[PDB]
Amino acid sequence: HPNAATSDVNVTIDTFVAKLKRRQVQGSYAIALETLQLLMRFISAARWNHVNDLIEQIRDLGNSLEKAHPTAFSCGNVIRRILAVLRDEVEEDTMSTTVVAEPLISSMFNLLQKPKTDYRQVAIQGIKDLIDEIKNIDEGIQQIAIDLIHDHEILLTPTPDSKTVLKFLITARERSNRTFTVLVTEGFPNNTKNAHEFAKKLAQHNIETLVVPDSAVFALMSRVGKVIIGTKAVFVNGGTISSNSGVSSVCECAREFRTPVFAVAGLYKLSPLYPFDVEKFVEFGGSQRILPRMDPRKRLDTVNQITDYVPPENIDIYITNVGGFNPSFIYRIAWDNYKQIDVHL
Amino acid sequence: PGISSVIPTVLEQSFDNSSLISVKELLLNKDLIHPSILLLTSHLAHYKIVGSIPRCIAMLEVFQIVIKDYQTPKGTTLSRNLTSYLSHQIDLLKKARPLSVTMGNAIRWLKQEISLIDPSTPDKAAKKDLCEKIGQFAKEKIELADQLIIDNASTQIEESTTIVTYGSSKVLTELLLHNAISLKKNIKVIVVDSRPLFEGRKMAETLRNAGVNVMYALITSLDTIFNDVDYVFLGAHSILSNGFLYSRAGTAMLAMSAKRRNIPVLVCCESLKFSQRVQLDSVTFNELADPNDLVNIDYENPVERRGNKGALLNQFIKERKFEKKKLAMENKPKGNKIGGKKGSEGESKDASNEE
Amino acid sequence: PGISSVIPTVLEQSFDNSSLISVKELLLNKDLIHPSILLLTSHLAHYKIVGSIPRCIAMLEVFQIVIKDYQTPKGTTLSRNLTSYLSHQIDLLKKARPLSVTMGNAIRWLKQEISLIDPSTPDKAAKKDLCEKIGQFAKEKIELADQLIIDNASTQIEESTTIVTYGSSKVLTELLLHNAISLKKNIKVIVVDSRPLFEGRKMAETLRNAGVNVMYALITSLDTIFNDVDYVFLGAHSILSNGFLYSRAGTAMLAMSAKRRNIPVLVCCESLKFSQRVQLDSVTFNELADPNDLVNIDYENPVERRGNKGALLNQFIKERKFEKKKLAMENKPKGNKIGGKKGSEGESKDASNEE
């Protein structure tokens, strides 16, 4: 379905699209919030009474959005979650309208063999619930994080950008008796300013700062205790796409020198799409912030990428609001909130 | 002698194996110091281009110049205070910035030469043959060695080659150029470079000036170009009698990656770069400059800007340290090509007795 | 009221988090305590036989006994100060020897039971049915599971065997005994012991009590031990949210050795022992004990020699510390034998939400 009714029925769809394409919007969380708001708007004014059709429309909407931007996934994920929420309710409803138990929460063979209400209010409530979840993940991660940090241990932190990760760090630092020193890589292309900001914030609280060049990790890794990330996108076979610069090489180094790798994670930040090739999911960067002047660019070839992908061979734990989980296991977690049908929309 | 100590930057709780600062801006210099040494010091202090090989050559040249300028006094003999002078110069160099193994070797050779010629021979005739012999030495233990390296590379490197490197090692540059214009072949040459220095950039520029297809690379994503890459040389500086390489920047990471993915890593060297001293980690003996090299927003080198950065003591504790020289590994750099032609770094000192 | 303070020996520097102190010899307490709990605590503290499997059973038995003895007061209902009593018991237990994962599970179950029948009932009807229920539960989730495990193991052996062993795993003792007796195969058993507590010795004794072909050795004596020999077995205490082997002491090294020397390892587990507490290291929370576990000079346990060592608090600058519970490497042990016969420990919490 195209954008024919979805322009005067709801107000700021075009604005949202613009924000997505031209990157007026800042923050994955913020994107998610915007998506939620859009969904709310869709719900409030428009009337349907027919449910399956509505669901299909929503799927189409989500799909189009996803196709609009091949590396921002939060928007998609939120929509998927909402779909999932709706679907179970619909299934429940059908059984009442018309008027068997499984070994666990979900069966496998049911996919091969043949299997007015205050629903709007429930839907409304769902969005609110989602919003609340998005607001207070940290109040659920807090007492799962302070379960794996000790004394006299060097802590490496590449890509420190989010308000979540910072807060996590702050909570740990509050218990100042717990001894930890912070090494922070600057992150060449984009992370630099952000890294500096993070360092400043650390200093504000009285947290010991060490500013790191990206070439110099091999020289530090043997002294590094525990490594924490604050990723953007979480995946199927265990790996992640992190918010830009210097993560692959770091991970390789860790693997070689055998180093523990923490990752701050959220299930809404987690994607059920499988990454199969480097040739697609890895997002490249601008040469504008490398070298001024364009006449040397005639013969040479500058190669740079913003956000980078991680193979699961390296990271080991995903500290969520639910708990820290294994990378060669997180698929189950995802499926406890997502499906195999809502994949290729 | 001048001014020592009284300088900014803390002692650093992490890494303090060598001292960190010195003499940059000249005032009250002694009335006997040769200007060439001073100028060299001034250069090295804020140097972009040179690293290991050309530095030594420059030093040699300077020494030759000094010798030319020197004549036997009426009171003091030819071997009376020369050695003292040399020592002073070495101390000045050390104060400025720590040195290389090749340099040490050269110094040793000079000392030997001082002993060899007896203080009774005609003075004019003495330095006549001295400067000739030094020139000969330079030709043999550098230029000839370089030639030999080139020829070694020639037999080994295949028809049509993609070569990936890091640094500013002049030998490698020469080799690349040779491959481009002299023997003539297809050369996809990729160079990597870090934040503080622009060695790689400079090399790329040089290659362009000779007309080569180049890819300019950075740390944040090396893998993106390998995952294709077939043959790789590293930034050679100094080998120890273990079988390692005390070398520049995150070359070690690259080497590791190479080891992981298909291919061995290889290095060319001069048969006088070798030491007999040994070490085994990037903590052992660190080569340091000021944490001021990374305050400015990148792009160029001399800029002067206003923004946010400029806090080494101002805010609530802020340490912004780095390294220049690190440890390259052993099991991976299997290739070594020298003045004695061939060998493995596993055979770490099989030419040190042969000399 | 109780007793705190006065602790033996120096507190070292690292691994400073868990309770390791205390009432070893009793001196004044609170006045309504049933002494069976206290006795049990005393036993557990100075125990040299217990190893994961039986402790929980013992605890259950004790609880049963308590229930049987329990008199409901003439005033207040069946659970008013009972909860307080239970809390006190727990506190005592912790003071003596930490609550394990199985113990936690048991506590949870008890709490559930308490909730199930809320205050409204008399005495000899409620507890009559409670005791029976709990017995039935014990019969179900424990003994039968063990039997199942045994029978799984029985098939797991094919033709011709030579094995190396460790640990006071009651189940493993049962297993090996079963092999010896009611399977009559060619079962060879090699035993490894440990200093903190003598489990290996006990195992050996048990083997003897059958008349088994037994070799015996220790943690270090292994390099010669493999010079035909295939199987290796371990006895884990608990598995967390992670799939990591959070068990007793000398396992991990052995496992590593086995991995290195070609033929893999298999461990056995129970379908109640899994936890939602998350950790990936030894340091987080460990069974830490008094250094008196390292005073004796070899051979046996009660000998007491005035040889070379016998002091701790007077030893200025000396940090004698040992660990009891470890966290073994995830990918190393291959097979795990729980209620659902066979599976990879990559399962971790596959039965945790299943409950």
UniProtKB/Swiss-Prot annotation, chain A:
The subcellular localization recorded is: Cytoplasm, Cytosol
Encoding gene per record: GCD7
**From what organism does this protein derive?**
Saccharomyces cerevisiae (strain ATCC 204508 / S288c) (Baker's yeast)
Please report which protein family the annotation says this sequence is part of. Belongs to the eIF-2B alpha/beta/delta subunits family.
Please state the protein's primary subcellular location: cytoplasm
Assembly information from the UniProt record:
Component of the translation initiation factor 2B (eIF2B) complex which is a heterodecamer of two sets of five different subunits: alpha, beta, gamma, delta and epsilon. Subunits alpha, beta and delta comprise a regulatory subcomplex and subunits epsilon and gamma comprise a catalytic subcomplex. Within the complex, the hexameric regulatory complex resides at the center, with the two heterodimeric catalytic subcomplexes bound on opposite sides.
**Sorted alphabetically, which PANTHER family does this protein's record hold?**
TRANSLATION INITIATION FACTOR EIF-2B SUBUNIT BETA (PTHR45859:SF1)
The protein in question is named Translation initiation factor eIF2B subunit beta
Q: Do the record's keywords include Zinc?
A: no
Q: Name one Pfam family in it.
A: IF-2B
Could you tell me the superkingdom of the organism this chain comes from?
Answer: Eukaryota
GO cellular component labels: cytosol; eukaryotic translation initiation factor 2B complex; guanyl-nucleotide exchange factor complex; mitochondrion
Keywords, in A-Z order:
Cytoplasm, Initiation factor, Protein biosynthesis, Translation regulation
Curated annotation (Swiss-Prot), chains B, C:
The answer to whether keyword Glycoprotein applies is no
Region named Disordered: 328-355
Query: Gene Ontology terms, cellular component aspect?
Result: cytosol; eukaryotic translation initiation factor 2B complex; guanyl-nucleotide exchange factor complex
Q: Which stretches are tagged as biased composition: Basic and acidic residues?
A: 342-352
Taking the first listed entry, what is the main subcellular location of this protein, grouped into a coarse class?
cytoplasm
Arranged from A to Z, the UniProt key words for this protein are:
Acetylation, Cytoplasm, Initiation factor, Phosphoprotein, Protein biosynthesis, Repressor, Translation regulation
Q: Where in the cell is it found?
A: Cytoplasm, Cytosol
Annotated GO molecular function terms are: enzyme regulator activity; translation initiation factor activity
Single GO BP term: cytoplasmic translational initiation
What domain of life is recorded for the organism?
A: Eukaryota
Oligomeric form and interacting partners: Component of the translation initiation factor 2B (eIF2B) complex which is a heterodecamer of two sets of five different subunits: alpha, beta, gamma, delta and epsilon. Subunits alpha, beta and delta comprise a regulatory subcomplex and subunits epsilon and gamma comprise a catalytic subcomplex. Within the complex, the hexameric regulatory complex resides at the center, with the two heterodimeric catalytic subcomplexes bound on opposite sides.
- Record family assignment: Belongs to the eIF-2B alpha/beta/delta subunits family.
Additional comment? Present with 10300 molecules/cell in log phase SD medium.
Q: What does this protein do?
A: Acts as a component of the translation initiation factor 2B (eIF2B) complex, which catalyzes the exchange of GDP for GTP on the eukaryotic initiation factor 2 (eIF2) complex gamma subunit. Its guanine nucleotide exchange factor activity is repressed when bound to eIF2 complex phosphorylated on the alpha subunit, thereby limiting the amount of methionyl-initiator methionine tRNA available to the ribosome and consequently global translation is repressed.
Q: What is this protein called?
A: Translation initiation factor eIF2B subunit delta
What fragment of the full-length protein is this? 237 to 593 of 651
